[PDB]
Design a protein around this ligand. Structure first.
Ligand SMILES: O=c1[nH]cnc2c1ncn2[C@@H]1O[C@H](COP(=O)(O)O)[C@@H](O)[C@H]1O
Lengths: 115, 112
């Protein structure tokens, strides 16, 4: 199936509902169901890449597109005071859904260290 | 650019450099928040991700691929976290866009 076998595949195929912010041929942006900030959404590729560590050289433009869409969506959602983008990789990264995605968090002061 | 990261790119002040090519530089953070903590920055002075243009797509993806490759080269095979800070709320410390890569310990949630 298009979108892979994770829960994010079900969202892409619209088998389960999501609060979608943006969609195109390459990616999908939607709100996180467990927000860690007043605004918290994800940007994901429609292509199933399990994690960033296995991305190929030819995935470069796709990954950049995730960041560009993340920035545009943040602007659209009025995060003019700033925001934080996050990618969790693997065990130490805290990854739980193995479909590459970018978090965008805003609407409050983010702290250092980032976890 | 007129930031400390510009000086580092120009080799005017030292940094522990990990990788370089014609369009980016990776180097260890001087104030590390994890056993491994480094930065990947473009040589193009983009002040912050919110001002990146569509034409910068390839370059931004390049930062992430270089980050991935450097993480592997530094032995972060148990995982890591990538971070880009924007503006005041994002805690952006230098107005030259930079990609953080942190690992060598469990990263926690929320990410700040
Ligand atoms: O069905 C969903 N809709 C929206 N967000 C989700 C869903 N399932 C998991 N997530 C989020 O996806 C992230 C997965 O964790 P991560 O792999 O560490 O980024 C968490 O922020 C979850 O709350």
């Amino acid at each position: 199936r298009p979108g892979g076998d994770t829960i994010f595949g079900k969202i892409i195929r619209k088998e389960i509902p999501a609060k979608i912010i943006f969609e195109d041929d390459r990616c999908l942006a939607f709100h996180d169901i467990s927000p860690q900030a007043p605004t918290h959404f994800l940007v994901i590729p429609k292509k199933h890449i399990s994690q960033i560590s296995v991305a190929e050289d030819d995935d470069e433009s796709l990954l950049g597109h995730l960041m560009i869409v993340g920035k545009k969506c943040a602007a659209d959602l009025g995060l003019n005071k700033g925001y934080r983008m996050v990618v969790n990789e693997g065990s130490d990264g805290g990854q739980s859904v193995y479909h590459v995605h970018l978090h965008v968090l805003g609407g409050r002061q983010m702290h250092w260290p980032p976890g």
